[PDB]
């Protein structure tokens, strides 16, 4: 078991917002949850849906023939830092800094979302869910990349789509980048109050190869 | 059938160079798996890397298992098309369509290739790119045809990586006819042999449709 | 000289629709103004907003001041190409190519356009596009070619605003000719008269190229 | 609305996982859009990345607006305006940025946010090897009840190269029913007048002029 903690500070089309999150699970399950709570008096005045996955490649289902390098990178842990450009020329970056002390996970994060047309399905609170994701990742200028297009399905029945970049950098002096692989993903919001005052959302994601036969 | 023939022409133009290809070839669109071999026109070598275009080179050719309806199979015997864009990290952007007919008992596919703004140094067109690595496409429905999501890995010829971001429209051209629901398709495209300055390639693709097997809370 | 004749073929493919146009015209490629008259082969409509290939349809036809490097009128005798993208806020996606040649007298682009992923119910493919408004373009030399960028605002029928992004690849075909210096090229094209269904259009462009004049440098 | 306006800035940001924060006084004349901005980079550690990819973070009230123009961000007074911004560079290093912008007493104050992401470490930004940005031409037009920016950003390397972006700015009035200007442009230059090593001070000034288009019409 490892515990999780995370803080987020955001602003998203000028509106700022901060989240403490708590949780945590079995790194080497590829699953985790984790409660987060909003700071301040305002309800969150956009979509959570589009920040997530700013509240742990730590946890990831790693198969043995595959490098797992963000398990690899302890005690150091790693950073990351993230965009998601929509459809509509919404984008948020993300970036989180993961430190493991006192026997705790900690992502400290920061979110920056802009350009999101005001009457788009983010800043109308319009997502329901965003779907299971698979993201592509590989090393390339000293970190490692990882693609992964997001579905969101709308309240309306409708996908409002993103492309995600990330960069994930270990802290961990000299540690070798892994080989190309993916990693897919499922985020659930499993509870939500009003104005995403407080989500519990949990994360299940298993590394894999191509399962593909060869030529 | 477990076995149908393929035949495509592509004409394409990428940063003003102009080439066409001819495809022959076929596999089992059951199985999700085909190959082809293609021959450049004119006796001169592509002035670019033949890699950004094998997916011009069919969408039938994907294993759909019973829990995901089958679009492109579906679409028979109007079939379908696409337009694709494959947009590159360094900037250039490849425009790809495809119309895609079926008559006498082979599956043409007529292709455009557009490919513009590639760094004149870039590993494009310094032609660097050794393979594509497989790939995962995500396929949702919006706004009344299906379309897919890619991220595209080559490997070039010093070791690194060189990406792209693919997005490609499917419409059926049998009217009316609805679109599947969100799922995905792994793909493995190999060029199995390749003639020097890709005059001629041999090229497979194996595609399986999938929904996520990740439990759910 | 100060009257230069165009021709014009572009074959074109957006969201699977093929059409060809065919333009004349000319103008004044030391003012910079020129117009040209383009018709749509076939009897069919132009299924697709005319107003996003408007720019397919040579920057010879641009007003240089002495002090600002002219790669295009320098580039003459053996003339230039164009690679370019336009990409727009909805992910609509038009590349667009062309050759030019000087053979004598008139001053000749063969043109492809491939438009791709424009969602069936926007702007483009829904023909809600009126005009496009002035634009700038900033030009730099970038790995051996002109680059420039350009900010696209489409008028729509409804009074809203529909956007893009314009990159330009410009290469000179004279050997060795040296790029020009940073900087803008301000652009006004008009569509002038259209008929139905864009089978004929008349077009006029005026541009520009300019430094900053603000102080400073 | 007088020919001059102090400004104070303070910016924190986050640029491929560098945390840093910048406070910046200055000003210049709103009405003849010239301003200057001297910066101070908090703490002792260097700028670990090109500076010049955030000088646009450091007000749109300076902007010389002839008559027939509309200027939404002087009209936006004493309410003032936000912005929020992405710069999207050709190697696909991204940075938003975001400012709350409040007239408070005379002073014009900027709350800025940065935030870079996907920056190739071996890229002219991560690797502190632009010289400057060239001048620019942002085309702005309405949309939603905001006021859209685009605008190509030239930035020269000092290999004498060019390294590009697209920048894009949503700018919102906080003066409520506050009508939204006609299409138009602003041409801009931004230079680094002096600049600390490490990016520990830099003084900026940009030059702002919003224009139609002046070329004839059919």
Excluded at 175 to 202: D, W, Y
Aim: aromatic share 14%; hydrophobic share 35%; glycine share 10%.
């Amino acid at each position: 078991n490892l515990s999780v903690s995370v803080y987020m500070k955001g602003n998203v089309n000028n509106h700022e917002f901060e989240y403490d999150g708590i949780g945590g699970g079995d790194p080497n399950s590829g699953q985790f949850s984790l409660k987060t709570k909003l700071r301040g008096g305002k309800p969150l005045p956009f979509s959570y849906d589009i920040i997530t996955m700013g509240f742990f490649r730590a946890f990831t289902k790693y198969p043995e023939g595959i490098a797992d390098y963000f398990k690899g990178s302890f005690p150091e842990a790693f950073q990351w830092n993230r965009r998601i450009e929509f459809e509509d020329g919404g984008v948020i970056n993300m970036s989180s800094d993961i430190t493991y002390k006192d026997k705790v996970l900690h992502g400290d994060v920061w979110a920056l979302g802009v350009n999101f047309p005001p009457n788009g399905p983010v800043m109308k609170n319009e997502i329901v869910m965003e779907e299971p994701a698979e993201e592509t990742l590989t090393a390339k200028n000293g970190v490692l990349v990882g693609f992964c297009p997001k579905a969101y399905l709308l309240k309306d029945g409708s996908y409002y789509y993103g492309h995600m970049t990330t960069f994930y950098r270990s802290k961990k002096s000299g540690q070798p980048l892994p080989g190309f692989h993916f990693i897919k993903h499922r985020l659930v919001k499993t509870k939500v109050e009003p104005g995403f005052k407080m989500v519990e959302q949990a994360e299940y994601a298993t590394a894999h190869v191509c399962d593909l036969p060869k030529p």
